């Protein structure tokens, strides 16, 4: 799961870590989008693109 996202992080913009990403949802209030639900990267990458703009707004 971590590797799946890792390969998806080296393209967006948050070249930092996916940890801060998880931190965003944590500090936010999203108990969803788990390591297993990370399948949004491969298929329908349009949904995983939304959270990308929601993590920055929070932190």
């Amino acid at each position: 799961w971590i590797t799946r996202i890792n390969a998806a992080i080296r393209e967006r913009g948050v070249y930092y870590n996916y940890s801060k990403f998880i931190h965003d949802l944590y500090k936010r209030q999203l108990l969803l989008n788990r390591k297993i639900l990370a399948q949004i990267a491969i298929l329908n990458p349009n949904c995983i693109y939304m959270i990308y703009n929601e993590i920055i707004k929070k932190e």
Partner: protein
């Protein structure tokens, strides 16, 4: 897949090998299959005038043995840039490639050549 071109001149070497070994594997794309090969076919153009940032350029290491009684044939970094400057970046990314027989395929997807050129104008660089 696609093909990308990168210039290796100011690069201090090594720091690039870890940034290129990810493209020839798909560690940057949707790599959802560690058992299957994928990624971009990024290749170096120069890799001959590549930097090093350090005094190791004249006393690095680079050792190999042919199993012969003598062997031990050791060479300094300064020699690599003198002879067969094409294996100065290859051998570098090789140790960065996972597995042994599978990761080898990812190695055949990277060319360095001399520099300022490349016989790959038919793959849309």
């Amino acid at each position: 897949k696609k093909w990308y071109v990168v210039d290796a001149t100011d690069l201090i070497l090594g720091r690039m090998a870890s940034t290129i070994a990810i493209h020839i594997r798909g560690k940057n794309l949707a790599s959802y299959t560690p058992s299957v090969d994928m990624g971009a076919f990024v290749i170096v153009v120069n890799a001959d005038k590549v930097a090093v940032s350090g005094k190791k350029r004249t006393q690095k290491l680079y050792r190999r043995h042919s199993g012969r009684p003598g062997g031990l044939k050791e060479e300094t970094f300064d020699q690599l840039q003198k002879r067969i400057p094409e294996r100065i970046i290859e051998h570098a990314v090789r140790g960065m490639l996972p597995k042994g027989r599978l990761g080898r395929y990812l190695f055949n997807h990277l060319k360095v050549y001399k520099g300022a050129e490349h016989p790959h104008q038919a793959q849309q660089p």
